Symmetry: C3
Subunit: 225 residues, 3 copies
């Protein structure tokens, strides 16, 4: 049982419901605003000093992230996020919340003229707090990478099959944590360095992640670097 | 009674309404999403808070269960290699404030990861999770019953396809083995049987007669009646 | 930056949050009710005079959209939607809202005895307003089509790859805007005319669409009949 301490997460008073609604909206802002490059909308999700971790970015502040994202546009980074289940753990005494947003990362790549997707199921974790004005903001963001897969875009062909089986060979896959191996191979081939100390549902960092989430709910200071 | 022409001709509170109705629909919607967020993550305390103490659940591989028996057989399934996840993909609520009854309609994809002869693959099943909700003595929304419409089914390659893997998977997903099961969850049932689970072949789809049975119970629930999904 | 002017979209007053919740529910009604043929539930999403656009129907009234959707059932149209991220831009001064609902359109097809899905990721845009009873209603609906893919249903086979390559040729795909090419091909083969003038994330109509969205938020009249 990774979450034995229960906070406000179902039912509750109207204020608690509304706070959980507002934090869920904040989290979904990643799927809605980042995919569409609605950058003012996106930046409103975060504290001014917020820190983000991604596969290809590693660690970033929020405008570090915004502009390395905008530069992802021209050298062919095409990433989308299907939101598929969002709920919130809320501590009204500390005004702290954890947003748990399940997503599929779907990234569209091209290898030797063949288009394909990599699809990675995961949990985005948003560490949120009310700022001095009563507005929820995300101070930290990190991802549990759960499972991933290769996805053809066109009808398969034996030609394309054997060209792609070369890049997604085992030897290239195992050098990355089980959970985001296909994503890592594909993004490496695009030329990004991979942050390989990212949490999955198989490795050490799982527990590190949940520990941070628990300390966050209790009102404590954390550091996700 | 239910037709495919219009299965839901009587409208309840499902959009707009009073602030109190909106909040009740929000709370029921959250409860439903608890399945995808909490069950996948084995957050069992959070999960159990979704249900009445006596709640009844149906799945393909478990058949009928209580919430307690379902929790137990679930936690044991992850050592038997069961790796099921749920993508939530559209949840709304029908609310009857006169009976304080609600129906949560939660679209999902069941996505289960399997292995066959060293070949990993997913089965993805699009469906409607139906939560039959009521308010308990503390005024909290709780799911008394849960059951699924299994709509459509597909095999999903995890790695790049290979001819070797193509025809070694063809042996398992033969029409012979597929058509033992209702259209809607055939691939899912073949794969879970290969895992050794007994399949409940009596579950609603969008093509069998249990479709009507399901909608009929949903209607009776909205009207405040007692139902029994063991049938 | 496509959305430079900010309206109510996060936090705000309790009334603003509740209005954004009501608009989000309205948008999700497309995936929950249309898929399940809950037509009376679906109809309550729209103003009486609402207009809708899809690839396979083009411009429709809500009443005519419902009728041709019913007619699609025995023409073999089996369309579903996976909702995958919905937020709302709200202007409380005009009581106007834009519902942005990400989805995957997932449509089941058959070609030469082989079944398959087309999956198309997109943004459903609901142009909503509070009506004179204070109910949120959509007056306009149109879609940004972002990207699509072929999806095998069964275990792949050399024969079925062979057969399907005939339908999803590059010559057949190139007739349609990048964003919904596989979807347009498969729906054309179902017998429908395709509306080739829908917004994508690659064509000029993208800007036309966002222009209308901004004018809608300001309380102005728009017309999406292009
Ligand atoms: K969703």
């Amino acid at each position: 049982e990774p979450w034995p301490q229960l906070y406000s997460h179902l039912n509750g008073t109207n204020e608690e419901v509304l706070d959980r609604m507002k934090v869920a909206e904040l989290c979904k802002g990643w799927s809605v605003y980042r995919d569409a490059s609605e950058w003012a909308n996106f930046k409103e999700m975060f504290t001014p000093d917020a820190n983000i971790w991604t596969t290809w970015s590693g660690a970033q502040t929020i405008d570090s992230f915004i502009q390395i994202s905008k530069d992802g546009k021209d050298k062919g980074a095409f990433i989308m996020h299907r939101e598929c289940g969002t709920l919130v753990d809320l501590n009204p005494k500390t005004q702290r919340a954890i947003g748990k947003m399940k997503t599929t990362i779907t990234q569209r790549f091209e290898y030797e003229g063949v288009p394909f997707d990599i699809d990675c199921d995961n949990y985005f974790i948003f560490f949120c707090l009310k700022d001095s004005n009563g507005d929820w903001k995300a101070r930290w963001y990190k991802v549990f990478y759960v499972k991933d897969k290769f996805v053809p875009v066109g009808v398969p062909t034996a030609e394309n099959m054997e060209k792609l089986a070369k890049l997604f060979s085992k030897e290239n896959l195992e050098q990355y944590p089980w959970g985001y191996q296909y994503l890592a191979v594909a993004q490496a081939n695009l030329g990004y360095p991979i942050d390989k100390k990212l949490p999955t549902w198989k490795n050490e960092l799982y527990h590190t992640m949940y520990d941070a989430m628990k300390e966050w709910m209790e009102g404590k200071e954390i550091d996700l670097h």
